[PDB]
Design an enzyme around this catalytic site. Structure first.
Site, PDB file in Angstrom:
ATOM      1  N   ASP A  70      11.935  16.160   6.704  1.00 28.09           N
ATOM      2  CA  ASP A  70      12.115  17.788   6.953  1.00 28.09           C
ATOM      3  C   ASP A  70      11.350  17.948   8.576  1.00 28.09           C
ATOM      4  OD1 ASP A  70       9.399  16.773   5.864  1.00 28.09           O
ATOM      5  OD2 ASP A  70      10.030  17.536   4.025  1.00 28.09           O
TER       6      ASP A  70
ATOM      7  N   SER B 173       7.261  16.943   8.016  1.00 23.15           N
ATOM      8  CA  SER B 173       6.617  16.560   7.969  1.00 23.15           C
ATOM      9  C   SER B 173       6.184  15.515   8.198  1.00 23.15           C
ATOM     10  CB  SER B 173       6.311  16.882   6.225  1.00 23.15           C
ATOM     11  OG  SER B 173       7.383  16.184   5.708  1.00 23.15           O
TER      12      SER B 173
ATOM     13  N   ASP C  44       4.062  12.113   7.056  1.00 26.49           N
ATOM     14  CA  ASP C  44       3.478  10.638   6.013  1.00 26.49           C
ATOM     15  C   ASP C  44       2.435   9.826   6.744  1.00 26.49           C
ATOM     16  OD1 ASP C  44       5.540  11.058   3.264  1.00 26.49           O
ATOM     17  OD2 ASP C  44       6.704   9.325   3.945  1.00 26.49           O
TER      18      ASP C  44
ATOM     19  N   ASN D 252       1.986  13.192   2.897  1.00 28.22           N
ATOM     20  CA  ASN D 252       3.037  14.143   3.015  1.00 28.22           C
ATOM     21  C   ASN D 252       2.288  15.263   3.956  1.00 28.22           C
ATOM     22  OD1 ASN D 252       4.182  16.066   1.743  1.00 28.22           O
ATOM     23  ND2 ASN D 252       4.744  14.660   0.761  1.00 28.22           N
TER      24      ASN D 252
END
Ligand SMILES: [Cl-]
Ligand SMILES: [Cl-]
Length: 129
Positions: free
Chosen positions: A48, A50, A52, A59
């Site tokens: 998406d 984002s 981690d 995230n």
């Protein structure tokens, strides 16, 4: 910092994760193994957009601010870089919130796909804890 398995188990235990929301310590060690290979500096982009961060791959869409993720809620109130420290305090404090969100450790896809339903106590076998 790349933690040894039992070294990470001891730090997670000290910070209160053993049996936190009912998840025994081996669950947390197994999750960290498959999320980060025990490396506090691990970072990985998610589908998406984002990213981690850290030993438990927390995230940037919900939990920390990295300045580059649309919709960031920063629910742990921290820069994502704080999740890369050799000291795991920030990652543990944030993980305690994540595991409280409703779905328990299923929030960690690697836990669900690689630890859930397995002999997770193996991850703390041999540890002096
Ligand atoms: Cl040491
Ligand atoms: Cl649960």
């Amino acid at each position: 910092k790349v933690f040894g398995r039992c070294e990470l188990a001891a730090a997670m235990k000290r910070h209160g994760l053993d049996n936190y929301r009912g998840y025994s310590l081996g669950n947390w060690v197994c999750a960290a193994k498959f999320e980060s290979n025990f490396n506090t500096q691990a970072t990985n982009r998610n589908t998406d957009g984002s990213t981690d961060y850290g030993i438990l791959q927390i995230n940037s869409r919900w939990w920390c601010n990295d300045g580059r993720t649309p919709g960031s809620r920063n629910l742990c109130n921290i820069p994502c870089s704080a999740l890369l420290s050799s000291d795991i305090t920030a990652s543990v404090n944030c993980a305690k919130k994540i595991v409280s969100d409703g779905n328990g450790m299923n929030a960690w896809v690697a836990w669900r796909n690689r630890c859930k339903g397995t002999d997770v106590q193996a991850w703390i076998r041999g540890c002096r804890l």
